[PDB]
Amino acid sequence: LPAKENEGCIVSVNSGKRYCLPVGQRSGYSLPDWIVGQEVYVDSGAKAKVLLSDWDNLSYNRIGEFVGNVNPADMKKVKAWNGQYLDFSKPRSMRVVYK
Amino acid sequence: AASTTTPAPA
Ligand SMILES: *[C@H]1O[C@H](CO)[C@H](O)[C@H](O[C@@H]2O[C@H](CO)[C@H](O)[C@H](O)[C@H]2O)[C@H]1NC(C)=O
Ligand SMILES: *[C@H]1O[C@H](CO)[C@H](O)[C@H](O[C@@H]2O[C@H](CO)[C@H](O)[C@H](O)[C@H]2O)[C@H]1NC(C)=O
Ligand SMILES: *[C@H]1O[C@H](CO)[C@H](O)[C@H](O[C@@H]2O[C@H](CO)[C@H](O)[C@H](O)[C@H]2O)[C@H]1NC(C)=O
Ligand SMILES: *[C@H]1O[C@H](CO)[C@H](O)[C@H](O[C@@H]2O[C@H](CO)[C@H](O)[C@H](O)[C@H]2O)[C@H]1NC(C)=O
Predict the structure, then answer these.
(1) Cα distances (Å, whole numbers) of residue A65 to A40, A74, A97, B7
(2) Mapping DSSP to helix (H, G, I), strand (E, B) and coil, where does residue A93 land?
(3) Which of A51, A70, A74, B8 is disulfide-compatible with A95, CB 3.0–4.6 A?
(4) Mutate which of A31, A55, A60 to disrupt the B interface (most B C-beta within 10 Å)?
(5) Which residues of B touch A28 (CB under 8 A)?
(6) Measured between alpha carbons, how far is A34 from A38 in angstroms, rounded to an integer?
(7) CA of B3 to the centre of ligand 1 (A)
(8) Which residues does chain B have within 8 Å of residue A55's beta carbon, measured at their own beta carbons?
């Protein structure tokens, strides 16, 4: 089921299970147990941008930015806010902002 | 500054 205009989603590759946030909201300190650390694709709504971290709590500027529909292949080596090239395909935290 | 983490308590 596709992300709304003002919502961003990660989706388990293996199971199809979705975790979504409206624009203006972030995850807990960690994603819930039922998605944390599963390989995902991003489905970000037209007005939304998904911020992922590979660590808990969107921490140490280990943050990557995703818009539209992104497959995990294209999330393995992404320039983070901190200038490192990280893998966000198995995220531990998330925020959704306006694109 | 950037968000931080802490070690899990026992
Ligand atoms: C990192 O986690 C923090 C909580 O420990 C906090 O949520 C932080 O987000 C920032 O929080 C500020 C308020 O403390 C401002 O609201 C700021 O806009 C916001 O980015 C988290 N970092 C990120 C990028 O979400
Ligand atoms: C990680 O370490 C930080 C100090 O270097 C800080 O204590 C941070 O705790 C959070 O600090 C925020 C300010 O940016 C808010 O005050 C928030 O309430 C508080 O948890 C530490 N992070 C965590 C999640 O404990
Ligand atoms: C909090 O948990 C993080 C993973 O979710 C990570 O382990 C982090 O480790 C800290 O990372 C910093 C990155 O600049 C420094 O290397 C710091 O030394 C290191 O402890 C955890 N933070 C803490 C304070 O335990
Ligand atoms: C590290 O210590 C922190 C207190 O200094 C804090 O207890 C943190 O626990 C997390 O705290 C978050 C809110 O800041 C959420 O409640 C989260 O559920 C909780 O784990 C400690 N780290 C860990 C990994 O527990």
Answers:
(1) 14, 12, 10, 26
(2) strand
(3) A51
(4) A60
(5) none
(6) 8
(7) 6
(8) 5
* Domains of chain A and any CATH numbers: 7-98 (2.60.20.40)
Cα–Cα distance list, A23 to A61, A85, A87, A97, A98 (Å): 19, 25, 23, 5, 6
Q: Experimentally, how was this structure solved?
A: X-ray
Are A57 and B5 an interchain contact pair (Cβ–Cβ within 8 Å)? yes
**Which tokens sit at A41?**
């694709």
Which of A91, A58, A95, A61 has the alpha carbon at shortest distance from A75?
A91
Task: List the one residue out of A25, A1, A3, A2 whose CA is nearest residue A98.
Answer: A25
